[PDB]
Ligand binder design. Structure first.
Ligand SMILES: Nc1ncnc2c1ncn2[C@@H]1O[C@H](COP(=O)(O)OP(=O)(O)OP(=O)(O)O)[C@@H](O)[C@H]1O
Ligand SMILES: [Mg+2]
Lengths: 238, 385, 51, 241, 99
């Protein structure tokens, strides 16, 4: 329809360039976020293209922007790469101003901000990347999970999934999850993430990657061995 | 083998004995009535001479005359008289004159066109009902709007009102839509017309709507009848020419449909099925209800459903030697039933390289990889990576 | 030549029909001719530069 | 239809212009890196040649961007030329500021942004260049990467770009060895280059070669571009000539 | 050598079945007193890329074209030179009259 250009509106009121931007997100690897009460776990599919691909120097799908906020992406990998760097200059700059580390609520606005800006204008295309930003505040210890989307609209979810057959993981999540009691133990919450990611890999225990953020600037990336034990618990019970 | 024979036992004897009967009986039919029937033959013969000059009937005036226009060219002011009635004569019919004085001696002819061949199908499908297996919740939906008000009108007067008119089958490719139209029409034994919507575009300008008049002129005489317009998605951006089909025609063909299917004409008692792979391509007023009523949406068959569809295809096949059949289904997620028919196609192709006549379990696993590789492009994970 | 089929080349042409005179409703006709002279190979060349 | 400018997407969330830019690559010759723990060979093939094309006085598909990182080029050489200058300028900027020869990662990541940037902003054309980055940094040792024209990167143990990408990749991974030798790595590059390339005899003059090694005298990093005669001799050894 | 001659409006159908009779005349005659040359001066009426054939006026010309093709195929391997012909445009030609 009115995809010939970005600035022109549409009888249907939907800017097509944003809608197609979403569609692009499904290209990239699945990423899932699940919050606990004392944890957030941020896991992502790390899809292996060939067996010649290094694990020596090849980028992880999960990138720390600052020392207590964590970020995964789903989308156009090319585009994500500058989006993550722009996020980061501001993030660090947040301390230049205030002499306070980066608050997760200020950070989601900013990431949505660079994106909103690109959409508003006409002489740039939007980012084809939806991101999940997980983290805790510096001041406090309650777990926080945010999303940005291409459009420049941001939300908070309890648990949320994006990229590569996102729908099927989303439904899976609803059924398993409880909002009355989110899991209050880091391990059980991890396990919920692994079960999700299992589905989209079909088979892999060397293609599931798990990262965790915990409060007070604890961020850790999990051993490939450690994830396989969790897969071992999930295959036996099934 | 011995199960096949039980079926083969009835089939041979009964029809071949009827054949032997009919052969002897050609003579025998004449013998009980040969003085009403040959009496009638005599009187028929006497008035009409030879030859019987065929003309084509323009129109009758109801008073015992008609105006005919022969193919041999002269027009004649005939009489409707003798072995012919006013109800048997309707425009476009081909009437029988006696040569030496044109008196209408009968009508024995209505169709001989090449055109009507197109619309009709001399069909024999290799999959009939209950090889639509699975998605059964939604086959139940096409039944209610096609099959079951033909089969019992009882139910649709017990509820009162009209039986719902038509349907649109629409969704992703591979979801078994084609096989539905052909198989619900197997059940009913109604006249299955079939025309494609890439054959509703014409390479002559303004003949496109004349063709669309032909589809429900045909439907209405051979009724009760099931008109399949297959792929009416090809109306929105697929067209043969531009300076001898053009933009005017594409819109006109759709205007034409409106008048056929719920215009004055109304043309009650034609069940219409439209398969279209996208309903957001289709015209807003042709997806108006009360000419196609409710829409049935299909989606890439779900994980339990693809068990059904795998059993339909591998019933033909010689089965898996080790068995991994139940795990094939599991690996597939968000995938078509056409992937299943392309997988048993692909298993026996790998088998076909050997030109072995068996099929083993291991061919299955290979064949799934082969055909998944074909689907995914090198610029998808080029664009992305 | 091996299978013993008439190689009938089709192309959408207006020359292969003296009756309808176009290749749009000669798709139906193709099947009935090829059915008399079976087995057959239908070579519908999609040249997509012919017209 | 959607084969226009860069702001616009296709309704399938494809930017046609990145997809075409990929396809640009296989209209310039094959280029192969094979990583080994003894060194990296970079080997390349000429897109075309004639009998009076001079190609023994200079390279033009192997450029040093600095004294420890060098690149093989496949694709439009015009698009390549500007990006090589920008890479090299940055390589020395890093030198001036930190007193270390630039890490392989920082240099690939920079150029991935730049390629991405010409697609994303304005009306400017995307780039249709694949550079195989082969470097040393004292963090990760030996490193191979390649960057898409799309403006992203992946690390490799072997990669092929340029013409005949699929076949050249297949023969490489078929005979690849995990530890390898530098000497074997050079041999496997001629073996593949023979079958993929439609030149009748594989001549020294259709080859450029450079090797980056720290095992040709330790303590130091030695970049050894092969001269025509060295190339000419090693064909003999492998018995193609 | 003998020189012959028509134009496609000398294959004018102004009586029914006139026009195909001309095709048979020129070619049979050429064979007979071979070596020979048939000239068809312009063929922009016979050489029409498309046709209708939904009326009588086409079908007579269409039959001329089809008969024209048939006799050139027979014509091969004779010591005649095969038809000289000329056209105006370059897309008068059928993929059938050029094959
Ligand atoms: N639920 C099912 N039961 C049995 N077979 C199935 C089922 N669904 C799909 N199939 C098989 O998949 C084949 C391919 O699908 P089919 O030709 O019917 O297409 P479609 O979804 O109408 O696509 P389009 O109309 O867009 O071309 C069917 O002919 C049938 O063999
Ligand atoms: Mg179909």
């Amino acid at each position: 329809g009115y995809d010939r250009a970005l600035s022109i509106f549409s009888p249907d009121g939907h800017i097509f360039q944003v809608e197609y931007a979403l569609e692009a997100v499904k290209r990239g690897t699945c990423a899932v976020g699940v919050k606990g009460k004392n944890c957030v776990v941020l896991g992502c599919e790390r899809r292996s293209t060939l067996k010649l691909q290094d694990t020596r120097i090849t980028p992880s799908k999960v990138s720390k922007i600052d020392s207590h906020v964590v970020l995964s992406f789903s989308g156009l990998n090319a585009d994500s790469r500058i989006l993550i760097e722009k996020a980061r200059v501001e993030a660090q700059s947040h301390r230049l101003t205030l002499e306070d580390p980066v608050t997760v609520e200020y950070l989601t606005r900013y990431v949505a901000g660079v994106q909103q800006r690109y959409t508003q204008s006409g002489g740039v295309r939007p980012f084809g990347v939806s991101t999940l930003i997980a983290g805790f505040d510096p001041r406090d210890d309650e777990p926080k999970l945010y999303q940005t989307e291409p459009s420049g609209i941001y939300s908070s979810w309890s648990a949320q999934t994006i990229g590569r057959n996102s729908k099927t993981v989303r439904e899976f999540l609803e059924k398993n999850y409880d909002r009355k009691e989110p899991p209050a133990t880091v391990e059980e919450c991890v396990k919920l993430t692994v079960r999700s990611l299992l589905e989209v890999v079909q088979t892999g225990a060397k293609n599931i990657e798990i990262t965790v953020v915990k409060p007070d600037s604890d961020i850790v990336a999990l051993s490939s061995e450690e994830i396989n034990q969790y897969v071992t618990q999930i295959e036996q019970e099934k | 083998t011995r199960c096949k024979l039980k079926l083969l036992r009835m089939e041979r004897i009964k029809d071949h004995l009827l054949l032997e009967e009919e052969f002897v009986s050609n003579s025998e039919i004449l013998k009980p009535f040969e003085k009403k029937q040959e009496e009638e033959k005599k009187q028929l013969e006497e008035i009409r001479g030879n030859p019987l000059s065929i003309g084509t009937l323009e129109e009758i005036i109801d008073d015992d005359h008609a105006i005919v226009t022969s193919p041999t060219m002269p027009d004649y002011y005939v009489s409707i008289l003798s072995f012919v009635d006013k109800e048997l004569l309707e425009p476009g019919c081909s009437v029988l004159l006696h040569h030496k004085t044109m008196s209408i001696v009968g009508v024995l002819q209505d169709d001989a066109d090449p055109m009507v061949s197109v619309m009709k199908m001399d069909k024999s499908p290799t999959e009939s009902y209950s090889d639509i297996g699975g998605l059964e919740s939604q086959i139940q939906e096409i039944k209610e709007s096609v099959e079951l008000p033909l089969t019992h009108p009882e139910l649709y007067e017990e509820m009162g009102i009209k039986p719902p008119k038509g349907v649109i089958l629409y969704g992703a490719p591979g979801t078994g839509k084609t096989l539905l139209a052909k198989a619900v029409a197997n059940q009913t034994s109604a006249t299955f017309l079939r025309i494609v919507g890439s054959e509703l575009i014409q390479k002559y300008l303004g003949d496109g709507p004349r063709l669309c008049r032909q589809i429900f002129k045909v439907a209405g005489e051979n009724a009760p009848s099931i008109v399949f317009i297959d792929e009416i998605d090809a109306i929105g951006t697929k067209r043969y020419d531009s300076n001898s089909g053009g933009e005017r025609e594409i819109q006109r063909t759709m205007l034409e449909l409106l008048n056929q299917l719920d215009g004055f004409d109304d043309r009650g008692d034609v069940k219409v099925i439209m398969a279209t792979n996208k309903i957001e391509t289709l015209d807003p007023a042709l997806i108006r209800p009360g000419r196609i009523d409710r829409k049935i949406l299909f989606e890439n068959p779900d994980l339990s459903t693809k068990k059904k569809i795998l059993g339909i295809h591998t019933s033909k096949m010689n089965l898996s030697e080790d068995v991994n059949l139940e795990t094939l289904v599991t690996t597939k997620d968000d995938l078509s039933g056409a992937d299943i028919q392309a997988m048993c196609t692909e298993a026996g192709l790998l088998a076909l390289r050997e030109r072995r006549m068996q099929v083993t379990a291991e061919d299955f696993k290979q064949a799934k990889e082969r055909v998944m590789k074909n689907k995914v492009e090198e610029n998808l994970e080029g664009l992305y990576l | 030549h091996h299978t013993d089929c008439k190689f009938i080349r089709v192309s959408g042409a207006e020359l292969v029909q003296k009756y309808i005179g176009e290749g749009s409703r000669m798709v139906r006709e193709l099947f009935v001719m090829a059915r008399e002279h079976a087995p057959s190979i239908i070579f519908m060349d999609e040249i997509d530069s012919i017209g | 239809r959607y084969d226009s400018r860069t702001t616009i997407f296709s309704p399938e969330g494809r930017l046609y212009q990145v997809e075409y830019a990929l396809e640009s690559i296989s209209h310039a010759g094959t280029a192969i890196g094979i990583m080994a723990s003894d060194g990296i060979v970079l080997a390349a093939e000429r897109k075309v040649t004639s009998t009076l094309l001079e190609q023994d006085t200079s390279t033009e598909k192997l450029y040093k961007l600095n004294d420890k990182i060098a690149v093989a080029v496949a694709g439009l050489t015009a698009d390549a030329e500007i990006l090589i200058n920008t890479a090299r300028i940055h390589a020395q900027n890093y030198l001036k500021t930190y007193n270390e020869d630039i890490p392989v990662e920082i240099l690939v990541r920079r150029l991935s942004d730049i390629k991405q940037g010409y697609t994303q902003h304005g009306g400017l054309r995307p780039f249709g260049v694949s550079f195989i980055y082969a470097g040393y940094d004292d963090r990760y040792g030996y490193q191979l990467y390649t960057s898409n024209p799309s403006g992203n990167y992946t690390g490799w143990k072997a990669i092929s770009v340029g013409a005949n990408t699929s076949a050249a990749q297949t023969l490489l991974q078929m005979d690849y060895k995990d530890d390898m030798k530098v000497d074997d790595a050079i041999e496997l590059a001629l073996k593949t280059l023979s079958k993929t390339t439609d030149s009748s005899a594989l001549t020294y003059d259709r080859l450029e070669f450079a090797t980056i090694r720290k095992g040709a005298n330790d303590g130091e990093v030695y970049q050894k571009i092969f001269k025509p005669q060295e190339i000419k001799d090693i064909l003999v050894k492998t018995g193609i000539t | 050598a003998a020189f012959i001659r028509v134009n496609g409006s000398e294959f004018v159908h102004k009586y029914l079945g006139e026009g195909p009779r001309m095709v048979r005349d020129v070619f049979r005659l050429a064979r007979e007193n071979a070596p020979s040359i048939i000239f068809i001066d312009e063929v922009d009426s016979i050489a029409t890329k498309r046709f209708d054939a939904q009326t009588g006026s086409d079908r007579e010309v269409q039959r001329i074209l089809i008969e024209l093709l048939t006799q050139m195929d027979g014509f091969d391997q004779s010591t005649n030179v095969k038809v000289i012909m000329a056209t105006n445009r370059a897309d008068t030609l059928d993929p059938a009259l050029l094959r």
